[PDB]
Amino acid sequence: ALAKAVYERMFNWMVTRINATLETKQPRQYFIGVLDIAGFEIFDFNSFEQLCINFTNEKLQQFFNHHMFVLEQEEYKKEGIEWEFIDFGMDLQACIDLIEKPMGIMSILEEECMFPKATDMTFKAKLFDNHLGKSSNFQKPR
Amino acid sequence: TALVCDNGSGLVKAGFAGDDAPRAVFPSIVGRPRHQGVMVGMGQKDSYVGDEAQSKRGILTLKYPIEHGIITNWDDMEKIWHHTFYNELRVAPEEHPTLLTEAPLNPKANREKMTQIMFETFNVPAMYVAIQAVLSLYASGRTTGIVLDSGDGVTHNVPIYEGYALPHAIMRLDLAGRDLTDYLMKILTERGYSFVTTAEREIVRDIKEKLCYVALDFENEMATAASSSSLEKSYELPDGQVITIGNERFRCPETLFQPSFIGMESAGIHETTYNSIMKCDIDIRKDLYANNVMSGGTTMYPGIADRMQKEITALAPSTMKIKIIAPPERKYSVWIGGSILASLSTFQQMWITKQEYDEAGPSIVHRKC
Amino acid sequence: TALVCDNGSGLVKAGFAGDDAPRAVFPSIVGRPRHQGVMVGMGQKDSYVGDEAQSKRGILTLKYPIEHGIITNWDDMEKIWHHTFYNELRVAPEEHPTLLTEAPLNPKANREKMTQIMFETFNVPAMYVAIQAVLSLYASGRTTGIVLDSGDGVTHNVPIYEGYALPHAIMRLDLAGRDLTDYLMKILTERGYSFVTTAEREIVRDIKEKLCYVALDFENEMATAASSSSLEKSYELPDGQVITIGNERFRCPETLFQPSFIGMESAGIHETTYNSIMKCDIDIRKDLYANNVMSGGTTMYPGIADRMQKEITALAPSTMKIKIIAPPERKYSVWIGGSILASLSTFQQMWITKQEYDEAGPSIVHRKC
Amino acid sequence: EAEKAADESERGMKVIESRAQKDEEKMEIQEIQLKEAKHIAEDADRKYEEVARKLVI
Amino acid sequence: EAEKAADESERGMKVIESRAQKDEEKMEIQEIQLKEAKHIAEDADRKYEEVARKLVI
Numbered sequence A: 001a002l003a004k005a006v007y008e009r010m011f012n013w014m015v016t017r018i019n020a021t022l023e024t025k026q027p028r029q030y031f032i033g034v035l036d037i038a039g040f041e042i043f044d045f046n047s048f049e050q051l052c053i054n055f056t057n058e059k060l061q062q063f064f065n066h067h068m069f070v071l072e073q074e075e076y077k078k079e080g081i082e083w084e085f086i087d088f089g090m091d092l093q094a095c096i097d098l099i100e101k102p103m104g105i106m107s108i109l110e111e112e113c114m115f116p117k118a119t120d121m122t123f124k125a126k127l128f129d130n131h132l133g134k135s136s137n138f139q140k141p142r
Numbered sequence B, C: 001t002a003l004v005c006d007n008g009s010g011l012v013k014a015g016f017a018g019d020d021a022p023r024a025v026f027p028s029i030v031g032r033p034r035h036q037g038v039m040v041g042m043g044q045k046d047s048y049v050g051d052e053a054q055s056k057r058g059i060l061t062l063k064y065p066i067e068h069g070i071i072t073n074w075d076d077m078e079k080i081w082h083h084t085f086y087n088e089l090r091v092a093p094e095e096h097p098t099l100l101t102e103a104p105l106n107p108k109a110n111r112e113k114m115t116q117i118m119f120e121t122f123n124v125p126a127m128y129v130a131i132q133a134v135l136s137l138y139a140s141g142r143t144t145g146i147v148l149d150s151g152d153g154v155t156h157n158v159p160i161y162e163g164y165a166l167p168h169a170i171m172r173l174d175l176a177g178r179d180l181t182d183y184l185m186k187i188l189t190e191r192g193y194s195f196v197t198t199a200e201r202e203i204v205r206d207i208k209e210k211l212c213y214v215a216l217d218f219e220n221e222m223a224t225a226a227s228s229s230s231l232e233k234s235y236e237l238p239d240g241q242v243i244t245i246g247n248e249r250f251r252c253p254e255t256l257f258q259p260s261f262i263g264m265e266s267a268g269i270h271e272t273t274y275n276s277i278m279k280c281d282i283d284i285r286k287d288l289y290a291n292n293v294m295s296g297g298t299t300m301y302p303g304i305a306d307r308m309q310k311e312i313t314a315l316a317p318s319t320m321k322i323k324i325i326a327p328p329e330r331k332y333s334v335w336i337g338g339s340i341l342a343s344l345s346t347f348q349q350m351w352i353t354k355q356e357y358d359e360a361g362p363s364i365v366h367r368k369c
Numbered sequence D, E: 001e002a003e004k005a006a007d008e009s010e011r012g013m014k015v016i017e018s019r020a021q022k023d024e025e026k027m028e029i030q031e032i033q034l035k036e037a038k039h040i041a042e043d044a045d046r047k048y049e050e051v052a053r054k055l056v057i
C-alpha cells in the first residue's frame, strides 16, 4: 500500500513540475478542456480493475445522457406537447445504484475487507444473498 | 460516520466511527469541592469532570459513578455524557448516530433506562448497545475464540465459535480492576506508609500502573525476592517523598490468579476461563484452546500472558496448543472494534431509529438486541 | 453416461455411470444452527448439508432425514438432492438420466412420491429405482446367491438364483447400522463416560469405526477379556481426553448376531439368512450355500465374515460348503453395481422417459418395475 | 552501567532464543517420528491380531 | 528508563531460558517413547512371522 501511494503521489508531483516549467502569469480564466479517459472494457478474465474502469467510463455516458436530455428538453419545450420519459439518466442509474449505492456492490468490498477473516468465496455468497432478484441487474453467467 | 463512546467505568474514551484511535480519552472521575469558598470572585464551577477534575484533586472529592458495570448515581454519569459530547469530541449529538458499550449481562433495568436517558434528552438520532466481548472479537479480526476483557469494572468470559455468541457459558466475575488497587492499599499499609484519603487512593492506581508484574511459580519468586534484595524498586509521589516497594510489587496482580487474598470465594480467572471452556461441546474445544484472546484493560501487566499460558496448559490436556493471542493493542481493543462495527454498512440497518422507540416504548433495546 | 446416486441413509454417494468409483461421497447429515447470531455481518447460511455441515457441528443440530429406509421430512432430503447435483457432482440434471436406489419393500408411497419430487422439480430426463440386492449382485459379477447388504438404515436378505429375484423369501429386518451406534451409547455410559448431546452421538460412530471387532465363541472371548487386560485399547476425542474401552469393543457388533441386548424380539442375522435359505426349494439349497455374498456397509467389521461362516455351518447340514464371498470392495458394492447397470446398453430401454410419466400419472414406477 | 548491563542480557536472550528455536525444530520432527512409530506399531498389532484369528479358524 | 529496559531484557532472557529448558525436557521424553514404539513394532513383526509360518503348515 505504501509503495502504491508513494508512486501515485510521485506521479502527481511530476505533473506539478510540468506545470512549473510551463508556468504563466497572464490573466487566464476561461478554458476549454480536453479529457482523455480509458475506454469501455470488455474482454476475457476481468477482475476488479475492469469493474473500476468500466464504472468510470460509463459515468461519463450518464453525464452525456443527462446533458443531451437537458438541451432537447428545452428545445422540445419550445415545441411543447408531451415528453416521453424525463431524465434519460435513469437508464444508467438503474446500474449506478447497483455498483455504488450503499450496500450495493462496491460498498460490499469495502465492508468485506474490514470484516474479519476475509475469504473470497464468502464475498460472492454475501452478494448472492443480498442482490439476487432483489437487484434486477445482478445475475450469473453460464 | 456515526460515533463510538465506551461506557467502561475506568476511562470513558470518545472517538469517531472508522478512525483507528479514540479521539479523546479521559478518566471517568467526577469531582465536587469539599471546602468552603474563601477568595470571593472565583466564579466556582459547581462540578468537575474528567482530566480537568483530576487536575485539582487537592480540594476535590471523587465519585466514580460507574461501579461493577452498573451505572449508579445517574446524575453525574449524565454529566459525563454531556461533557464528553460537547467539550471532548465537540459535536452536537443531533447529527450523529451513537453506539455505546456494556458488560455481558449487568442488570436488566440498566440498558432499559440508559437508552431512555441518552435518547430523550440528548435527542440522539439512533443508538445500539453492543455487549463487550463480541465487539472485542471484531477488534482483533478473529471470529472464533474466548474473550477475557476484564475491563476495570468487571471481568468476564464468553465462548464464541465460528461467529456464534454461545450464551450459556458466559461466566461473569466481579474481580474488577479497581479492587486490585483497593487491595494494594491494604498491602501497602504494612510497609509503613498510609494512603487514607481519596486523592491518594487515586494516586495509588498510578503507582500500580508501573510497578506490578505477575510472576510464575508465585511461591518460588516470593521467597526469591524475600531472600535477595535484587528487585527493591523506588518511585516518587508528587510530594517529594520516595517510596520503596518490595514483594508487594508482584503480590499485587496475583489477586487475579487467586482471590483468597481479597477474600472472595470464586476461583481465579484462569480456572474460570478453563471452566467456560469445559462447558461446551466435545468438538469446539479443538479450536477454542488455540484462539484465546485477552482484551480490555488491566491486562497490560507484563508477564500475565505467559503466566496464563502456564496455568491453562497445566489444566488442559497436554495435547492441545494453547497459544494465546495478546496483542499490545489492548486497553483499546474495545474501541477499535466498536469503530470497525460502526463502519460496517450492513450494520446500518440494525440500530434503533427514533420512530421505533417512540412508537414502541423503552423495552425496544432488550427486545431487539 | 447417465448418473448413479445412492439413497442409503448413511452416506449419499454420487458418481457417474460406468466409473468404478463414486466421484463424491459425504455423510447425509442435515444441520441447523441452535443458537442466536451474535457477530453481525456473518451472512449466515440458513441450512447446511454434508461434510460442510459436519465441519462445524459445534453449533449445529443434526437431522438425519433418512431413517429405516423411509425418507422422512422430505424438505431436507430434497435439500440434499439439490446440494448433491450442483455442488458435489456439478451438472444440471437437465442433461443426465438418473438412477436411484431403494431398500427391498420399504413402503408403497415412498417411491410413488419420490419419483414425483425428483422428477418434477429437478426436471430430470429419466429415472428408474432399482432394489438394492439385485444391484449388489451384479456389482460382484455373481448372478446367483443371497445378498446381505445391511445398509446402515436397514438389513435384509434376498434369495436370487440363476438371475431370478425370488420374491417371497425376502426377509427384511430393521436391525439398522445406526442402532449399533445407539446401543453403544448405552453401553459406554457404564464405563463412566457420557455422550448425551447429538454432536457426540455423531462422534461415537466414528469411534465405533475402528474399535469394534466381532469375536467367535462370544462367551469365551468375553470371559477372556474380562480376566486378562490384554486388549485394553485407547483412543482420543478431538477434545484432549483419552478414552479406554474394554470388552465393549467386542460387545458392540454382537447385537447383530443376537438382538436380546437391543431388545428387539427378532432373531439375529445369521438365523434370518438361514431361514430365508430354508424357505426355498430342495434343489436351490445346493448352490445357495456356496455363493453367499455380503454387501452394503456395516460389515467392514473385521471377523464378521468368519463368525458368520461358523454360525451357518453349524446351522446347515454339515455336508455343504458355505464358503462366503466377502470382497473388501464392500460399502461401495451398491454403487459399483449401479454404475455397471447404468452402463448396460440393453438396459437403456427400461427406465422411464418424461412422456410416460406425464401421460400416465405417478404410479408408473410401481407398475413398471 | 545500566545500558551496558541491558546489552549483555539482550545478547544472552538472543542466543538462548536461537537455541530455543533449534530445540523446537528438532522437537517437532521427533514428534512426527513418534507419531509415525506409533502408527506402524498400531498397524502391526492389527496385522498380528488378524493372522491370529485366521489361524484358529 | 535504562533500568526499566534492563529489567525487561533480564525477564525476556529468563522466560525464554525457562521455555528452552521445558523443550529440552520434552525432547528426551519423546525419544524414550520413540524407542518403545519402535520395539513394539519390531516385536509385532517377529510375532506375526511365527503365526504366519504355522498358518501355511
Ligand SMILES: Nc1ncnc2c1ncn2[C@@H]1O[C@H](COP(=O)(O)OP(=O)(O)O)[C@@H](O)[C@H]1O
Pocket (backbone or CB within 6 Å): B006, B007, B008, B009, B010, B011, B012, B150, B151, B152, B153, B154, B177, B178, B205, B208, B209, B210, B296, B297, B298, B299, B300, B301, B331, B332, B334
Ligand atoms: N500501566 C498500567 N498497567 C496495568 N494496568 C493499568 C495501567 N494503567 C491503567 N491500568 C488499568 O486499566 C484499567 C482500565 O480498564 P477498563 O476501564 O476496565 O477498560 P476501559 O478503559 O476500556 O473501560 C484501569 O482501571 C487501570 O487499573
Ligand SMILES: Nc1ncnc2c1ncn2[C@@H]1O[C@H](COP(=O)(O)OP(=O)(O)O)[C@@H](O)[C@H]1O
Pocket (backbone or CB within 6 Å): C006, C007, C008, C009, C010, C011, C012, C150, C151, C152, C153, C154, C177, C178, C205, C208, C209, C210, C296, C297, C298, C299, C300, C301, C331, C332, C334
Ligand atoms: N470403520 C468402520 N467399520 C465398520 N463400519 C463402519 C465403519 N465406518 C462406517 N461404518 C458404517 O457404515 C455405515 C454406512 O452403511 P449404509 O449407509 O447402510 O450403506 P450406504 O452408505 O451404501 O448407504 C455407517 O452407518 C457406519 O455405521
Ligand SMILES: [Mg+2]
Pocket (backbone or CB within 6 Å): B008, B009, B010, B011, B012, B152
Ligand atoms: Mg475505562
Ligand SMILES: [Mg+2]
Pocket (backbone or CB within 6 Å): C008, C009, C010, C011, C012, C152
Ligand atoms: Mg450410506
